[PDB]
Design a protein around this ligand. Structure first.
Ligand SMILES: [Mg+2]
Ligand SMILES: [Mg+2]
Ligand SMILES: [Mg+2]
Ligand SMILES: [Mg+2]
Ligand SMILES: [Mg+2]
Ligand SMILES: [Mg+2]
Ligand SMILES: [Mg+2]
Ligand SMILES: [Mg+2]
Ligand SMILES: [Mg+2]
Ligand SMILES: [Mg+2]
Ligand SMILES: [Mg+2]
Lengths: 134, 108, 58, 205, 113
RNA sequence: AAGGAACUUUGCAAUCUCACCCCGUAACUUCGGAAGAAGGGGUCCCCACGCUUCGCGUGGGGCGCAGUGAAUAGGCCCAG
RNA sequence: AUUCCUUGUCGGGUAAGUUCCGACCUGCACGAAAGGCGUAACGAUCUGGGCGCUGUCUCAACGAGGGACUCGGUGAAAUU
RNA sequence: GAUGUCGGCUCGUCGCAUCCUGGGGCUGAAGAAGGUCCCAAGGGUUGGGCUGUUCGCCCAUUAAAGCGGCACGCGAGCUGGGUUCAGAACGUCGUGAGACAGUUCGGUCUCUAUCCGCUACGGGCGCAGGAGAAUUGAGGGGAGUUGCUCCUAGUACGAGAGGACCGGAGUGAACGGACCGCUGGUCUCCCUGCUGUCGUACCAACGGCACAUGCAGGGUAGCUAUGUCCGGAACGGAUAACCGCUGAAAGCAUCUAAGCGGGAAGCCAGCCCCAAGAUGAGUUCUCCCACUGUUUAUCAGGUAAGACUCCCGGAAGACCACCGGGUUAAGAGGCCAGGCGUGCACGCAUAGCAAUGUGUUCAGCGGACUGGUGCUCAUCAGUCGAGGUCUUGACCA
């Protein structure tokens, strides 16, 4: 799963290449904006969970920079997620999508496939720019 | 503890054949699991996962196969229950010549 | 040192309340059907070597 | 109230619609009734049901006497059920119904003597920054000259498992009478082959 | 728990060199007395061995030769004993227990073909 | 498994590295060194061909997940 | 490693640094062979940072062996 | 003739001058959000950076990230960073030896628990016959947490901006319990691949050693989480703060002195678990039955019902204990069939200079899994185990 110290890849053109998980929010997207934490614990973030993260390396020229403290929403965990039919998906690398306090990507596009779990999590816009939704 | 005489074995088959499905052969080598994604709004989608077969674990209801695929620059593996309602049909694309029922080695 | 160590000599009594459980159970000898000497149930008669016929050497 | 007796059998996959659901196949063989305790006979209401069959050559005389008092046929297991009744015997037929939430209670597998990490979670200590109290071993047991002793109950190592457990509220996915088979979602206590007792939800939502 | 299914009291190779050593003596001498438990270990193992021998093809010989490193003993099980048990549903080896012993109080026993 | 120093007084401990060929190798320097710096590649089997022979190079072929294929066997760097 | 007030003040690196690096200077109580300042190379030296790897850690699990338990033989100790 | 010292880690438990959830009065309380005081400790109270720290500062969150007590809780539990040994250095004091509000680097923390206490598990006796089994619950333990979204409702309220109580839905977190179907981990020899060496005469095929698996790939049952399933409740009773009905003493007023009602995450019951050594030892159903022994061996001795001993095993287990079988037998092993694991065997044949490839071969091999079958061993036999005190009362012809 994902947890503080866990570096995820960035699947958007936000400008940040790699981010380090600073904290695990309890993914509150809903109602008006993003909702606030469902508890102060919760140790692992799963595809679809929102986390707070620090930026470890960003590309030269791009909205986001090295050091920025941002919010990303986990789209590909190297962990297995178990869809209800009983099937299991698992990507070769953890990777996330940086976002804003509305849950919209900071980037103009998403790279690589995205866990289809983000669709139930209601992150439609993310699903929107997804090349694929495995 | 309760010591009744009984083939707990078959009792399970009887409650398991009703949820067991055969599928083309295959063992590795490519496949194309054209599966349904009824999971969108009402809108019943239709994705096709195709790529190397790396594992056949199980038997009965529990039987399944694992296909590895690289999509959009990122390696992806899926686990399918031969008899998973989301699986419409499976078709071989090309028999492969390997040497061990696994291939995990193939993850590089 | 010898860290834990006892606080007091124990009564000849106490010391015996203890051992109230070390009494051997005598074997439950059976009498061999042939040479009739006593034997140990489920084993061979050390005196005739039988166990229905003669298994062990005389 | 209502309830039956049975042998756990295994778990397995089963799709109810398009959702794969795990279940525990329980054989709730028919259960004879061998004694009705009444608030006017034994001082409280309840039914004596029976389970596995037992060869007669193995039945104590005293027991025969009992079992005969109701021309049943030696079982090997008898158990009571408060405020329960009807006439004849007890089979899941009409007793339980698909969808009913229930409470399966068996005897947990037995773990023998287990330390505190595994019996209570605890946490033991380090593994490198110095020791001999590596992982397991509890910490301290009390305090000091005050309560110059240890609390009744302080969690410690001890025979773990081998207990009566009751997992509440379980949906009954499928009932195949005439096989006295029954599939409950989730997982029931104890080993396959073990006795298990199913009942109305003692207290469900 | 520990609901496994086998025995050791030695490492992994010792426990294999013994079962092979007794397997061979049992077959080379039709009978041997041994600690009660050890015979218990031996019994199934050996029976399996008699059943592998009970095939006559080179393959079945070569397999036996993996757990019977004495050419003479393999020939015996291969040509004298396996053929003899032809008609019995692999079920011959019996254990008789004798008396307890002096040097260590251990109850000995007989395992015979 | 997933994560990867979040442990903790301190990555203590335990991993990684780990041989021999080839290529490649910074600051700074008393020009010796810093260097095994760093980094990358090779390494088995058959055959022909040529070579200074044990051995080796060239080309083609072959097998495994993997070829110092099992034992011996540097973790590296910046700064004070 | 010689600063008390003190985690001094600014800068650096970090999401966040009582530590560390660089400046400043108000050097409680620096200072030139009880040597001053610097200095390549060397260190099982001391300090801070980084890359890689990892059961150090989130949480622990499973396995192995050697004790611990049981039976037969021999049979101590500190203490009191 | 020694009560180990700071901090941490582990383990907790208690107080309330309550940090958060729960209930209330007043507010300068429109609603939303707060403030404040009263009642209330059930449960809960995150993860990091800096420092030996305790503290505190800061990051990122949270319903909240409470304050204290228990020898500033806990070293016969661990650590040993801090500091009140011996080395060394700097600054400072001393002529010196040395020293210090100081600073800094280094520097052995003692297997075996007697008694009480605590967690587990037996043995004895008791519970007025001797037994098999089913139970009541005296009492006692565990649990007791919280968010967010939707609905009501864009309603009541409000100029607007914003925006509810009450009640009804869902979905998480953390914690726990059980479980192994899933997804994974492991699986010390279940299958295969590989190297060096020695051996089985040699070739081929195999074995050993290279951990206490030589290395690697995989892996059933089991065990196991980061995997599953379920759970904290409802209703009820009596209450706290607080609010009230009828109502005098003070012909009015008054939650009050007669009386009566509502009212909290708290108390009691409820839920799960233990439970008659509840020596006040309870209840129910069933079985065995009334033997033998001359004031010389005064009581034990044959026995019934039943059970133990012993053997063979177990999803039970340290040992005991517990469950199953013990030939009128399917208990375990073997054996057969099947499952599942590994991945195509040895031999031969063919292709090739060969290394190898292909065919025979979805081969071969085979731990624990499902069944079947008397092939094996549970043989034989022994030991123990009732004849029921007395008083009162009630019923029987
Ligand atoms: Mg698997
Ligand atoms: Mg631990
Ligand atoms: Mg410097
Ligand atoms: Mg002894
Ligand atoms: Mg309030
Ligand atoms: Mg102490
Ligand atoms: Mg292995
Ligand atoms: Mg009330
Ligand atoms: Mg035993
Ligand atoms: Mg029995
Ligand atoms: Mg079997």
């Amino acid at each position: 799963m994902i947890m503080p110290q866990s570096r995820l890849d960035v699947a958007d053109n936000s400008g940040a290449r790699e981010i380090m998980c600073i904290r695990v929010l309890n993914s509150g997207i809903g109602g008006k904006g993003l909702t606030t934490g469902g508890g102060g614990n919760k140790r692992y973030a799963h595809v679809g969970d929102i986390i707070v993260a620090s930026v470890k390396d960003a590309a030269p020229r791009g909205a986001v920079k090295a050091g920025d403290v941002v919010k990303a929403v986990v789209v590909r965990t190297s962990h297995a997620i178990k869809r209800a039919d009983g099937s299991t998906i698992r990507f070769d690398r953890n990777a996330a999508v940086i976002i804003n306090n509305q849950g919209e990507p900071r980037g103009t596009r998403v790279f690589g496939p995205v866990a289809r779990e983000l669709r139930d999590r209601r992150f439609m816009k993310i699903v929107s720019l997804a090349p694929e939704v495995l | 503890q309760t010591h009744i005489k009984i083939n707990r074995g078959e009792l399970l088959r009887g409650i398991e054949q009703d949820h067991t499905r055969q599928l083309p052969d295959f063992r590795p080598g490519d496949t194309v699991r054209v599966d349904t994604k009824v999971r969108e709004g009402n809108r019943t989608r239709s994705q096709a996962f195709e790529g190397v077969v790396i594992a056949i674990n199980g038997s009965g209801s529990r039987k399944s196969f694992t296909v590895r695929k690289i999509s959009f620059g990122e390696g992806v593996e899926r686990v399918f229950p031969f008899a998973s309602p989301l699986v419409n049909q499976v078709t071989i694309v090309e028999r492969g010549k390997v040497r061990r029922a696994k291939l995990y080695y193939l993850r590089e | 040192a010898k860290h834990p160590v006892p606080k007091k000599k124990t009564s000849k009594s106490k010391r015996d309340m203890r051992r109230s459980h070390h009494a051997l159970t005598a074997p439950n000898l059976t009498e061999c059907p042939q040479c009739h000497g006593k034997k140990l149930s489920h084993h061979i008669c050390p005196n005739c070597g039988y166990y229905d016929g003669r298994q062990v050497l005389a | 109230m209502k309830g039956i007796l049975g042998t756990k059998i295994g778990m397995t996959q089963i799709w109810k619609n398009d959702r794969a659901i795990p279940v525990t196949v329980v054989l709730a063989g028919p259960c004879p009734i061998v004694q009705r305790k009444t608030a006017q006979t034994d001082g409280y209401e309840a039914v004596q049901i029976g389970y596995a069959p037992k060869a007669e050559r193995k039945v104590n005389k005293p027991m025969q006497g009992h079992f005969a008092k109701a021309g049943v046929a030696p079982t090997r297991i008898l158990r009571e059920f408060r405020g329960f009744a009807p006439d004849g015997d007890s089979v899941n037929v009409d007793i339980f119904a698909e969808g009913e939430k229930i409470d399966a209670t068996g005897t947990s597998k037995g773990k023998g003597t287990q330390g505190v990490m595994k019996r209570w979670n605890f946490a033991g200590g380090p593994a490198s920054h110095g020791s001999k109290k590596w992982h397991r071993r509890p910490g301290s047991i009390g305090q000091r000259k005050t309560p110059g002793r240890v609390y009744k109950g302080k969690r410690m190592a001890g025979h773990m498992g081998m207990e009566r457990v009751t997992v509440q509220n379980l949906e009954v996915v499928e009932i195949r009478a005439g096989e006295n088979l029954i599939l409950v979602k989730g997982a029931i206590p104890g080993a396959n082959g073990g006795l298990v007792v199913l009942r109305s939800a003692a207290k469900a939502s | 728990h520990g609901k496994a299914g086998r025995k050791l009291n030695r490492n992994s190779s010792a426990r294999v060199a013994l079962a092979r050593a007794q397997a061979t003596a049992l077959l080379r001498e039709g009978r041997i007395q041994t600690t009660l438990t050890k015979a218990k270990e031996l019994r199934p193992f050996v029976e399996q061995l008699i059943t592998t021998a009970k095939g006559g093809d080179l393959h079945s010989r070569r397999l036996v030769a993996q757990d019977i490193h004495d050419k003479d003993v393999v020939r015996k099980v291969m040509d004298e004993v396996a053929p003899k048990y032809a008609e019995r549903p692999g079920g011959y080896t019996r254990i008789l227990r004798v008396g307890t012993r002096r040097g260590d109080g251990v109850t000995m026993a007989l395992i015979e073909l």
